[PDB]
């Protein structure tokens, strides 16, 4: 449960190249002397697998993923491999499949088992009266919420350590498709020392377990044999592969044994067998696949801007309004760039409520309002929801759901003068508070007492619009600050304020994705020699094919060249003659991909020979290929 084995040594993740392993039967369909095509999770040839051991210096049992499909292959001489752990999170929180063999039955239980830190099995006291009897079961601790249970036939498995070389081979397939778990078994005698067999065989199904659960990881258990942490192991190994959804071809004989296997995405020699659907390929040139270059990225090629919102007459204005008679300006039908307002390095106060100004730049809005008023330094901080005083209660009140920005900077050099600036006014007394987005421009005399004022000043009759005071001999906190309040709302009107611009550089001779004002797609920008008209934007070919464009911000004509495509040709010899093939692409050079350039394309795999021989296999435009010594 908590005691882990101290005989574990860290091994680097090496690899092992397989030749033709990983071919099984995808279904129970029998054929004869044909090549059936199918799409399933198969093991690709000449791939890299894990390099693990089950010996007494290297004893490692890590956790490998399962959702991509895995293949199991392990040699055996004394039955060290006992069982596996199939769990989603390898914990008791979720369900888990347990397939183990205690040399009497195949225990198949789907419960929420309590997995230990390092579960293992083994036989104790190998000094005398061993008998190879299983006497240790430390896999799980408890069981809860079981949904499936299966007991196999009773038998007796021997774990005798025969000396010499390896004599048994057991390879399984561990995959789960739509809840149906499959076990594909194979047992055959071999003769190994260390490495994997570089041969070919098939795998037959044994059982069927419709568990209906999702499995993400797995773990392979090992056995321990020593004559509770320093127990050593025997001598075995296990390799774990990774399945991939590729297409294989199976050659069924009269008995049903798979003899050959063709990988359609390994080498261009085997690519002709999947297209022709025949094992014996005649001498010639055939088409296998279609070459295509994927685009790199999408770049919006807009150097500068075109339209602009009137921020110059609002921010850089000479005279503003008062705090009670502020003018509301509707900003719409224009593109606004909010990124230059934050990186201007000239605003002493810039705060947005609800969302960041760097986040609303990539977002379309429909109604933008802008205000402007000059107040003292003790009144800029009252422009916030929930404030009190003279500005927030009697002059300008903000609602609680304010989703705008507050812009304020220093304007002491312009809005102040020697002698006192008595231009701006503010309301001092009012009978009640103001509503959000309410303007009060009334000049009525405030009646503080019970006697009427009759429009003139007297006892308890003061003028509400008091004049401000700005002097250059004051402190830092009394300087006039130009406050700009931005309002943002959402209605049923369509959005007119947009413009998220992303331009990086001038890209040439690359398969990229262009995005213009009235044209988009995938093309290769290159030089041109035409003279486009200043009002035109793009040009087309005869059969409605756009092949040229003009940048609206840069006087340069760029042709829209299609990217590198064309058929994939290959020169294949006979099945009993040779195996060398050459790569021949169509309508491309040898730079956009034994190198030789042809008129039909780039020929990779052939040598340029000045001696002219007889045309055996044609290439194109007076070029052929043959086989010489």
């Amino acid at each position, epitope marked *: 449960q908590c005691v882990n084995l101290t005989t574990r040594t860290q091994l680097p993740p090496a690899y092992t190249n397989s030749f033709t392993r990983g071919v099984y039967y995808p279904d129970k369909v029998f054929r004869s002397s044909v090549l059936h095509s199918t799409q399933d999770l198969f093991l690709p040839f000449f791939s890299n697998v894990t390099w693990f051991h089950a010996i007494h210096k290297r004893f490692d049992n890590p956790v490998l993923p399962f959702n991509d499909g895995v293949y199991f292959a392990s040699t055996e001489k004394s039955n060290i491999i006992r069982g596996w752990i199939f769990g989603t999170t390898l914990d008791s929180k979720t369900q888990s499949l347990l397939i183990v063999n205690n040399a009497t039955n195949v225990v198949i239980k789907v419960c929420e088992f309590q997995f230990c830190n390092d579960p293992f099995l083994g036989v104790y006291y190998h000094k005398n009266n061993k008998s190879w009897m299983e006497s240790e079961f430390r896999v799980y601790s408890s069981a809860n919420n079981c949904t499936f249970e299966y007991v196999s036939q009773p038998f007796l498995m021997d774990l005798e350590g025969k000396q010499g070389n390896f004599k048994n081979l057991r390879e399984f397939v561990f995959k789960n498709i739509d809840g149906y778990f499959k076990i594909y078994s194979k047992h055959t005698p071999i003769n190994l020392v260390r490495d994997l067999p570089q041969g070919f065989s098939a795998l037959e199904p044994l059982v069927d377990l419709p568990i209906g659960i999702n499995i993400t990881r797995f773990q392979t258990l090992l056995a321990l044999h020593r004559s509770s942490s320093g127990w050593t192991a025997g001598a075995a190994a296990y390799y774990v592969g990774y399945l991939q959804p590729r297409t294989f071809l199976l050659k069924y004989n009269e008995n049903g044994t798979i003899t050959d296997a063709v990988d359609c995405a390994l080498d261009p020699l085997s690519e002709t067998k999947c297209t022709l659907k025949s094992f014996t390929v005649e001498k010639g040139i055939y088409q296998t696949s279609n070459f295509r270059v994927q685009p790199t990225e999408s770049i919006v090629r807009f150097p500068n801007i075109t339209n602009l919102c009137p921020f110059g007459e609002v921010f850089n204005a000479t005279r503003f309004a008062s705090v009670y008679a502020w003018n509301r300006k509707r900003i719409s039908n224009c593109v606004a760039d909010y990124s230059v307002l934050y990186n201007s390095a000239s605003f*002493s106060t810039f705060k947005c409520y609800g969302v960041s100004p760097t986040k609303l730049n990539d977002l379309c809005f429909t109604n933008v309002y802008a205000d402007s008023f000059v107040i003292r330094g003790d009144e800029v901080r009252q422009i*916030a929801p929930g404030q009190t005083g003279k500005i927030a209660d009697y002059n300008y009140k903000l609602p609680d759901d304010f989703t705008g920005c507050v812009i304020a900077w220093n304007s002491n050099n312009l809005d102040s003068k020697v002698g006192g600036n008595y231009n701006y006014l503010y309301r001092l007394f009012r009978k009640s508070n103001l509503k959000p987005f309410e303007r009060d421009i009334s000049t009525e005399i405030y009646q503080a007492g019970s006697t009427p004022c009759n429009g003139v000043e007297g006892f308890n009759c003061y003028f509400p619009l008091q004049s401000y005071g700005f002097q250059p001999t004051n402190g830092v906190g009394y300087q006039p600050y130009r406050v700009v309040v931005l309002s943002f709302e959402l209605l049923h009107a369509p959005a007119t304020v947009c413009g998220p611009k992303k331009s990086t550089n001038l890209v040439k001779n690359k398969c990229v994705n262009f995005n213009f004002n009235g044209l988009t797609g995938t093309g290769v920008l290159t030089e041109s020699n035409k003279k486009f008209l200043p009002f035109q934007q793009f040009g087309r070919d005869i059969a409605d094919t756009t092949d040229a464009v003009r940048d609206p911000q840069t006087l340069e004509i760029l042709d829209i060249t299609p990217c590198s495509f064309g058929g994939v040709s290959v020169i294949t010899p006979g099945t009993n003659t040779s195996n060398q093939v050459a790569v021949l692409y169509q309508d491309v050079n040898c730079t956009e991909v034994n190198v030789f350039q042809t008129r039909a394309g780039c020929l990779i795999g052939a040598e340029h020979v000045n001696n002219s021989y007889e045309c055996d296999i044609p290439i194109g435009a007076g070029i052929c290929a043959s086989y010489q010594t």
Partner: antibody
Amino acid sequence: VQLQESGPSLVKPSQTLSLTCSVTGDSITNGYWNWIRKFPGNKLEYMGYISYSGSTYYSPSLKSRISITRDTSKNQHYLQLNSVTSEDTATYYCASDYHGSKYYFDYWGQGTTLTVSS
Amino acid sequence: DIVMTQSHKFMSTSVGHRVSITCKASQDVGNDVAWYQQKPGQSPKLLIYWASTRHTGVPDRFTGSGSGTDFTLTISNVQSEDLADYFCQQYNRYPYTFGGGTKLEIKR
């Protein structure tokens, strides 16, 4: 500028808090005086502010539960809270919003921890 | 209010290592992002104002840069007398909502 707080550190619920932040070294000519509530566990929260001419403005955190006065003769300023509850067990600091000789300064005192209990 | 949120709770560097304390607030931090300096056994003091200028008595190693709301207090060659709790804030408009905090210590 040297700052030192003084006053009683025991205020029962439904009573009046009274303390004094002393200023020594610089006169009250420039800079503001604010208050920041210190939660136990290295957490701070703004309380309010005052000017140095007579403009007494309040914060949205304390609309009517705060009363800050000024004193330009002794160069001090008081602090008074109304309806003191059990959530006011904290420490209040006074700092100066001074900006002189082309530099921005911010000095802090020691602080008196207030504990509200029975 | 501006909801300040810090990610790193403590930073353990050595002499010559770089101290990286991020301030990923949910709202806009502004341009006047400041940093405190809580000396052990003393009151916290101001370190950086206006995101480019240091306080009186501060060496040139305490700088700051960044872009947007992802600001980082750039500290190069931190000495043994720099163990202080650093807070990220804004000096643009009252009130001043602060963050959690990050404790700086040396490795011995």
